[PDB]
Design an enzyme around this catalytic site. Structure first.
Site, PDB file in Angstrom:
ATOM      1  N   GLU A  95      16.672  -0.680  -4.454  1.00 51.75           N
ATOM      2  CA  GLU A  95      16.903   0.711  -4.066  1.00 51.75           C
ATOM      3  C   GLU A  95      18.391   0.922  -3.825  1.00 51.75           C
ATOM      4  O   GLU A  95      19.094   0.003  -3.380  1.00 51.75           O
ATOM      5  CB  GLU A  95      16.106   1.101  -2.818  1.00 51.75           C
ATOM      6  CG  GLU A  95      14.613   1.218  -3.040  1.00 51.75           C
ATOM      7  CD  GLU A  95      14.206   2.403  -3.912  1.00 51.75           C
ATOM      8  OE1 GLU A  95      14.927   3.430  -3.978  1.00 51.75           O
ATOM      9  OE2 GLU A  95      13.125   2.314  -4.527  1.00 51.75           O
ATOM     10  N   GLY A 127       6.604  -8.397  -6.076  1.00 51.30           N
ATOM     11  CA  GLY A 127       5.627  -7.370  -5.780  1.00 51.30           C
ATOM     12  C   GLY A 127       4.866  -6.955  -7.026  1.00 51.30           C
ATOM     13  O   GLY A 127       5.236  -7.309  -8.159  1.00 51.30           O
ATOM     14  N   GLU A 140       3.508 -11.662  -8.770  1.00 49.52           N
ATOM     15  CA  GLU A 140       2.116 -11.255  -8.948  1.00 49.52           C
ATOM     16  C   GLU A 140       1.762 -11.210 -10.441  1.00 49.52           C
ATOM     17  O   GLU A 140       1.826 -10.151 -11.056  1.00 49.52           O
ATOM     18  CB  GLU A 140       1.853  -9.922  -8.222  1.00 49.52           C
ATOM     19  CG  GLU A 140       2.241 -10.045  -6.753  1.00 49.52           C
ATOM     20  CD  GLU A 140       1.556  -9.080  -5.818  1.00 49.52           C
ATOM     21  OE1 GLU A 140       0.874  -8.147  -6.281  1.00 49.52           O
ATOM     22  OE2 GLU A 140       1.708  -9.266  -4.593  1.00 49.52           O
ATOM     23  N   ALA A 163      -4.973 -11.322   2.091  1.00 46.46           N
ATOM     24  CA  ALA A 163      -6.412 -11.217   2.328  1.00 46.46           C
ATOM     25  C   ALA A 163      -6.847  -9.760   2.426  1.00 46.46           C
ATOM     26  O   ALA A 163      -7.328  -9.290   3.469  1.00 46.46           O
ATOM     27  CB  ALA A 163      -6.783 -11.980   3.583  1.00 46.46           C
ATOM     28  N   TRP A 179       0.512  -6.156   5.973  1.00 50.48           N
ATOM     29  CA  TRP A 179       0.980  -5.231   4.956  1.00 50.48           C
ATOM     30  C   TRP A 179       0.445  -3.857   5.341  1.00 50.48           C
ATOM     31  O   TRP A 179      -0.762  -3.635   5.222  1.00 50.48           O
ATOM     32  CB  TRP A 179       0.469  -5.607   3.565  1.00 50.48           C
ATOM     33  CG  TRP A 179       1.082  -4.679   2.542  1.00 50.48           C
ATOM     34  CD1 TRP A 179       0.616  -3.456   2.150  1.00 50.48           C
ATOM     35  CD2 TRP A 179       2.313  -4.878   1.845  1.00 50.48           C
ATOM     36  NE1 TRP A 179       1.483  -2.885   1.242  1.00 50.48           N
ATOM     37  CE2 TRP A 179       2.532  -3.743   1.037  1.00 50.48           C
ATOM     38  CE3 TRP A 179       3.264  -5.896   1.842  1.00 50.48           C
ATOM     39  CZ2 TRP A 179       3.651  -3.615   0.211  1.00 50.48           C
ATOM     40  CZ3 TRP A 179       4.369  -5.771   1.018  1.00 50.48           C
ATOM     41  CH2 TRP A 179       4.552  -4.641   0.211  1.00 50.48           C
TER      42      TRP A 179
HETATM   43  C1  LIG Z   1       3.033  -8.983   0.150  1.00 45.29           C
HETATM   44  C2  LIG Z   1       2.149  -8.059  -0.681  1.00 45.29           C
HETATM   45  O1  LIG Z   1       0.996  -7.771  -0.278  1.00 45.29           O
HETATM   46  N1  LIG Z   1       2.583  -7.571  -2.008  1.00 45.29           N
HETATM   47  C3  LIG Z   1       1.782  -6.654  -2.932  1.00 45.29           C
HETATM   48  C4  LIG Z   1       2.208  -5.289  -2.701  1.00 45.29           C
HETATM   49  O2  LIG Z   1       3.067  -4.990  -3.816  1.00 45.29           O
HETATM   50  C5  LIG Z   1       1.096  -4.330  -2.568  1.00 45.29           C
HETATM   51  O3  LIG Z   1       1.547  -3.042  -2.136  1.00 45.29           O
HETATM   52  C6  LIG Z   1       1.785  -2.200  -3.203  1.00 45.29           C
HETATM   53  O4  LIG Z   1       3.139  -2.447  -3.647  1.00 45.29           O
HETATM   54  C7  LIG Z   1       3.509  -1.602  -4.821  1.00 45.29           C
HETATM   55  C8  LIG Z   1       4.805  -1.942  -5.235  1.00 45.29           C
HETATM   56  O5  LIG Z   1       4.975  -3.222  -5.806  1.00 45.29           O
HETATM   57  C9  LIG Z   1       3.349  -0.151  -4.365  1.00 45.29           C
HETATM   58  O6  LIG Z   1       3.587   0.695  -5.446  1.00 45.29           O
HETATM   59  C10 LIG Z   1       2.008   0.106  -3.838  1.00 45.29           C
HETATM   60  O7  LIG Z   1       1.928   1.466  -3.343  1.00 45.29           O
HETATM   61  C11 LIG Z   1       1.628  -0.814  -2.792  1.00 45.29           C
HETATM   62  N2  LIG Z   1       0.165  -0.605  -2.417  1.00 45.29           N
HETATM   63  C12 LIG Z   1      -0.231  -0.597  -1.024  1.00 45.29           C
HETATM   64  C13 LIG Z   1      -1.673  -0.410  -0.658  1.00 45.29           C
HETATM   65  O8  LIG Z   1       0.592  -0.743  -0.164  1.00 45.29           O
HETATM   66  C14 LIG Z   1       0.112  -4.856  -1.524  1.00 45.29           C
HETATM   67  C15 LIG Z   1      -0.914  -3.946  -1.277  1.00 45.29           C
HETATM   68  O9  LIG Z   1      -1.825  -3.686  -2.304  1.00 45.29           O
HETATM   69  O10 LIG Z   1      -0.484  -6.144  -2.048  1.00 45.29           O
HETATM   70  C16 LIG Z   1       0.328  -6.892  -3.006  1.00 45.29           C
HETATM   71  O11 LIG Z   1      -0.163  -6.631  -4.264  1.00 45.29           O
END
Ligand SMILES: CC(=O)N[C@@H]1[C@@H](O)[C@H](O[C@@H]2O[C@H](CO)[C@@H](O)[C@H](O)[C@H]2NC(C)=O)[C@@H](CO)O[C@H]1O
EC number: 3.2.1.14
Length: 369
Positions: A49, A77, A119, A190, A337
């Site tokens: 950002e 992410g 991921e 989780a 989170w």
């Molecule tokens: C540490 C962690 O849980 N990372 C992941 C997150 O990226 C994810 O949150 C989501 O991140 C996206 C960006 O990379 C966002 O666009 C999105 O809105 C956001 N979703 C939420 C519910 O916060 C979280 C949560 O799903 O889990 C992982 O996958």
């Protein structure tokens, strides 16, 4: 015990009371604060950002108020995808470029460590060779952090990773026993066990299975995920149980069938602040007017419905239950989170500021005395 909390660098763009600004950061709420997210440019750690450097100063500036606090920077992410990780881990040269860049970046900006949020290796487009290459990356980072501590005399940079709960992703990407040796702690994601990608309702983060479930579905719960990571070789002391301050929403096929497992036609209506169909912040569900809150008896977590909208989420009681669980399993703490999805400003839920995360802190006996 640890209480590891994620900050997100896009929460600053939400409107009204949901806008999360530096003033909303509490230096003593959590033991570890992780900044989501950094990215990568030519195999080197980089910001995502326009104002990250400003926020880094604020974020790491919290340590002036609370010198016990540790901060980490998360790379990756979901949205970041896999290609840049794949290309970086493909060669020893690119890994070295990355590792050296990470050390310099973390020291420049006053972070205490790096959190890996790929991921995921071996999935989402990443080839099978990335399973062992991820192991090597983790080893390269751990060993280089050790060496920098020795050479510089400074306290060693921490290395953590956010890891998936589902067996498909775990087995495609993670040599659990090997990586757990080299990670300081393991942030178990989780949550996201169920959501509007499925055509029946199911809870975002159930503690246990439902009696009706079978097969692979019977492992899509917190207890199974924790046991999975422990049995595959993660020391309990290193395993940090993730906790969601959001829920996952569905549009029901019929307002007359509101059960867990009821047919759904798609994502729930986007929330007024989060504006993302299929999820809602805790502050967007805690004060739903004219709704009906229910508990999934087997799973120890709530859901709520109104007309054709159905949301599975976590509340104060489910967070308490989950902390009791993690303590019984001897885990290293809780992870959350995210900061900005709790009622961080106390504007919605009539429970004060950070009602969910303060519950974690209390139940972990981490209240500043
Ligand atoms: C540490 C962690 O849980 N990372 C992941 C997150 O990226 C994810 O949150 C989501 O991140 C996206 C960006 O990379 C966002 O666009 C999105 O809105 C956001 N979703 C939420 C519910 O916060 C979280 C949560 O799903 O889990 C992982 O996958």
């Amino acid at each position: 015990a640890k209480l590891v909390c994620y900050f997100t660098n896009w929460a600053q763009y939400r409107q009204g009371e949901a806008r999360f600004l530096p003033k909303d950061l509490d230096p003593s709420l959590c033991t570890h604060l992780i900044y989501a997210f950094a990215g990568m440019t030519n195999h080197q750690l980089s910001t995502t950002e326009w104002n990250d450097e400003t926020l880094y100063q604020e974020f790491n500036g919290l340590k002036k108020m609370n010198p016990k606090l540790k901060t980490l920077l998360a790379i990756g992410g979901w949205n970041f995808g896999t290609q840049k990780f794949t290309d970086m881990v493909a060669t020893a040269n690119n890994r070295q470029t990355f590792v050296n860049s990470a050390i310099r970046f973390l020291r420049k900006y006053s972070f205490d460590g790096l959190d890996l949020d790929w991921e995921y290796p071996g999935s989402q487009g990443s080839p099978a060779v990335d399973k062992e290459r991820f192991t090597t990356l983790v080893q390269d980072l751990a060993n280089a952090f050790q060496q920098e501590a020795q050479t510089s005399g400074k306290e060693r940079l921490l290395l953590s990773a956010a890891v998936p709960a589902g067996q498909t992703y775990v087995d495609a990407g993670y040599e659990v026993d090997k990586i757990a040796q080299n990670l300081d702690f393991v942030n178990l994601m989780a949550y996201d066990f169920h959501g509007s990608w499925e055509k029946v309702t199911g809870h975002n983060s159930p503690l246990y299975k439902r009696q009706e479930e079978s097969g692979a579905a019977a492992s899509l719960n917190v207890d199974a995920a924790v046991q999975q990571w422990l049995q595959k070789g993660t020391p309990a002391s290193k395993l940090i149980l993730g906790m969601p301050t959001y829920g996952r929403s569905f549009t029901l096929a019929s307002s007359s069938d509101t059960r867990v497992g009821a047919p759904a036609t798609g994502s729930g209506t986007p929330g007024p602040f989060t504006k993302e169909g299929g999820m809602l912040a805790y502050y967007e569900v805690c004060s739903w007017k004219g709704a009906t809150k229910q508990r999934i008896q087997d799973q120890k977590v709530p859901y709520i419905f109104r007309d054709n909208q159905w949301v599975g989420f976590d509340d104060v009681e489910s967070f308490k239950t989950k902390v009791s669980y993690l303590k019984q399993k001897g885990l290293g703490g809780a992870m959350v989170w995210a900061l900005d999805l709790d009622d961080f400003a106390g504007f919605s839920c009539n429970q004060g500021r950070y009602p969910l995360i303060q519950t974690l802190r209390q139940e972990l006996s981490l209240v500043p005395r």
